[PDB]
Amino acid sequence: PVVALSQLNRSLEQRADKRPVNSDLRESGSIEQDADLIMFIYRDEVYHENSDLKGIAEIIIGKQRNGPIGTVRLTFNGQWSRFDNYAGPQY
Amino acid sequence: MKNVGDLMQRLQKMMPAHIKPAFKTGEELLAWQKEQGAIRSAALERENRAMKMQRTFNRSGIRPLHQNCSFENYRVECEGQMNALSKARQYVEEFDGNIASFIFSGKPGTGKNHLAAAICNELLLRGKSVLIITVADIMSAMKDTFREQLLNDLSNVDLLVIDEIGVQTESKYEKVIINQIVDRRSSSKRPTGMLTNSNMEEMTKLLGERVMDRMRLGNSLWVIFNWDSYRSRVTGK
Amino acid sequence: MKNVGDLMQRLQKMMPAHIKPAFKTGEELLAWQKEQGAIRSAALERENRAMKMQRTFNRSGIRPLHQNCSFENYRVECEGQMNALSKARQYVEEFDGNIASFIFSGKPGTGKNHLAAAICNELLLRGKSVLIITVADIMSAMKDTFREQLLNDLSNVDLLVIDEIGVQTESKYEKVIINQIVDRRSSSKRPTGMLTNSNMEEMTKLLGERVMDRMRLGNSLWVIFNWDSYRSRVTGK
Ligand SMILES: [Mg+2]
Ligand SMILES: [Mg+2]
Secondary structure, three states: OOOOOOOOOOOOHHHOOOOOOHHHOOOOOOOOOOOOEOOEEEOHHHHOOOOOOOOEEEEEOOOEOOOOOOEEEEEOOOOOOOOOEOOOOOO | OOOHHHHHHHHOOOOOOOOOOOOOOOHHHHHHHHHHHHHHHHHHHHHHHHHHHHHHHOOOOOOHHHOOOOOOOOOOOOHHHHHHHHHHHHHHHHOOOOOOOEEOOOOOOOOOHHHHHHHHHHHHHOOOOOOEOOHHHHHHHHHHOOOOHHHHHHHHOOOOEOOOOOOOOOOOOHHHHHHHHHHHHHOOOOOOEEOOOOOHHHHHHHOOHHHHHHHOOOOOEEOOOOOOOOOOOOOOO | OOOHHHHHHHHHOOOOOOOOOOOOOHHHHHHHHHHHHHHHHHHHHHHHHHHHHHHHHHHOOOOHHHOOOOOOOOOOOOOOOHHHHHHHHHHHHOOOOOOOOEEOOOOOOOOOHHHHHHHHHHHHHOOOOOOEEEHHHHHHHHHHOOOOHHHHHOOOOOOOEEEOOOOOOOOOOHHHHHHHHHHHHHHOOOOOEEOOOOOHHHHHOOOOHHHHHHHOOOOOEEOOOOOOOOOOOOOOO
């Protein structure tokens, strides 16, 4: 495998929903065609303070070459820097 | 650049003995992290619940007098509202999945908003969502629209209870607004609540018979008060 | 390394034996897959149509209190709407290819939206599309267009009916909206309908004689209720 980070264009913030999707990264889309697996990230406790998803991030998958797509829930405790499994309800 | 044992001999220039590491392998560490994760996640879920709960309680705009406000801090003095309590208690007990609407009317200083707020507190302890308002605030919301969230909450909420319906004798608009609300609600299989000072007859030319048709569902709960005041006695602890 | 006999001799050891390949050649395989595919496509198409039908149910604005709703759960007490149901059944029957629009009227608590929702469900089962609205929703939509699927739909559905046409006394807007709508509908040889609580003369000054003239085509269907309320019975089943 390979793991290659990237970045996103700020034409998403004005959407007022702020979940990422495939057509949001604008680097020619040259990697959207080359890849096999993608995992965007969203985390509500940045863009809001009072939003009731504190200590949670989520893994928006947007492309799967050999499988389907989905969405996953994980936590974040940024002072010792490790996501953990979310043993709880569904999304 | 340095040996293992000697790296550790560099390490022991920091703390004493009696600090043994206890790991002894890797997969045991993964088990340990999994333990801590399953712990901290559930504790976090608890805290998230308490947050969401408070986000409700600060949103049900109730003014602080009627907050430390329950069935119990209600000094009974005659039967006239002993019946009111016997009805309001069972109203709460019957609220679970019912078209159960109530109205209050009578004289001020008789415990209208007190019982209303007690009800709302108990229903929020059950884990519901409610709201009360002043009719002028609805006016103000419809004006802010002409400068949606609060507008549509008045039909996305389970229960509403309404306050100060008689005043604003600049009428003919109040009626159409309240009609709009209550039709959207009662057609949607949900309750509401009113508060006033007048008899139903006086009330009915303000509020055409259709609205009270939308009120008189199920075992619709009419109540009317006649007590004298209480305000000279109250302190505000 | 390995080859065919060794490969398959590796293969059988994974499983229980007597598992013969059952094909033995190519054209049999292709025929078999064509057969499975033509079997699969049919049930697929069926499911897709069922989806479409659900999307048509959930689009109409029928509220839950008129959802579990039809002709048969409507209780007779006199001739006064025995006539009405003998009209409603035949109306649903005479609807296909027909400029047959209608109005209801009279007292609240009398089964207007009930019959309307019954009609709407029966025409969904006929395979035709419907919609019922509060007029204030059209108001809000015309205001929200500053933010077209809805206004497009309102001039292309087969049927349409309306609710809360009396109130909103701040007129000089309601009349023109509904006139535009009904012109675009009647022009395309399509019906519509209305619901109200007022008299035709009490209606006509709100709604100029032209609009009611556009309602007066085919064998029209006027109704005027006299029945009393129903609310005391209902409990929200
Ligand atoms: Mg009060
Ligand atoms: Mg109606």
